[PDB]
Enzyme design. Structure first.
Site, PDB file in Angstrom:
ATOM      1  N   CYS A  46     -16.504  25.291  -6.140  1.00  0.00           N
ATOM      2  CA  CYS A  46     -17.651  24.566  -6.674  1.00  0.00           C
ATOM      3  C   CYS A  46     -17.579  23.087  -6.307  1.00  0.00           C
ATOM      4  O   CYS A  46     -16.761  22.342  -6.844  1.00  0.00           O
ATOM      5  CB  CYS A  46     -17.717  24.723  -8.194  1.00  0.00           C
ATOM      6  N   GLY A  47     -18.442  22.670  -5.384  1.00  0.00           N
ATOM      7  CA  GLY A  47     -18.458  21.283  -4.958  1.00  0.00           C
ATOM      8  C   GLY A  47     -18.967  20.350  -6.041  1.00  0.00           C
ATOM      9  O   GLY A  47     -18.470  19.234  -6.191  1.00  0.00           O
ATOM     10  N   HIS A  48     -19.961  20.808  -6.795  1.00  0.00           N
ATOM     11  CA  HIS A  48     -20.537  20.006  -7.868  1.00  0.00           C
ATOM     12  C   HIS A  48     -19.448  19.474  -8.794  1.00  0.00           C
ATOM     13  O   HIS A  48     -19.655  18.496  -9.514  1.00  0.00           O
ATOM     14  CB  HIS A  48     -21.544  20.834  -8.667  1.00  0.00           C
ATOM     15  N   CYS A  49     -18.290  20.124  -8.772  1.00  0.00           N
ATOM     16  CA  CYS A  49     -17.169  19.717  -9.611  1.00  0.00           C
ATOM     17  C   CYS A  49     -16.465  18.498  -9.024  1.00  0.00           C
ATOM     18  O   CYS A  49     -15.975  17.637  -9.756  1.00  0.00           O
ATOM     19  CB  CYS A  49     -16.175  20.869  -9.765  1.00  0.00           C
TER      20      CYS A  49
END
Length: 140
Positions: A46-49
């Site tokens: 998860c890049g949003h993390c």
């Protein structure tokens, strides 16, 4: 009680810039003697993390020197299935709180100010869990 089982050096816990790392293995062992423990769920895919990575660390310190004192830690749901299913973590990033063994689902803008408000607010001895519970694993 008072057994003293130390040797294999298994019961341990690491951290990152103030962010402790808990796992199904050291989950309870950590919250064992903790009134309030902040649990942050995330995923490596998860890049949003990544954008939150630094956003969280900053928080840790905040709630670190806060009163009462709280221990900010994170958990890789992906790696921790048991825990993931515990708080029905069907998404990420997913923030949660543990109160004397009571899972408190968070709701709102996950910000250094908001996130802290709830946590620091729950840490209080007067604070109590509201009705309409989602899950109650033999709470008691």
């Amino acid at each position: 009680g008072s057994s003293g089982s130390s040797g294999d050096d298994d019961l341990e816990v690491k951290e990152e810039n103030g962010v402790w790392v808990l796992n199904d293995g050291n989950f309870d062992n950590f919250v064992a003697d903790k009134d309030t423990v902040l649990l942050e769920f995330y995923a490596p895919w998860c890049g949003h993390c990544k954008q939150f990575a630094p956003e969280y660390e900053k928080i840790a310190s905040t709630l670190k020197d806060n009163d009462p004192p709280i221990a900010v830690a994170k958990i890789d749901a992906t790696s921790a299935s048991m825990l993931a299913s515990k708080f029905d973590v069907s998404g990420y990033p997913t923030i949660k709180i543990l109160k004397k063994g009571q899972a408190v689902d968070y709701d709102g803008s996950r910000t250094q100010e908001e996130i802290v408000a709830k946590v620091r607010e729950v840490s209080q001895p007067d604070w109590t869990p509201p009705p309409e519970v989602t899950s109650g694993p033999s709470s008691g």
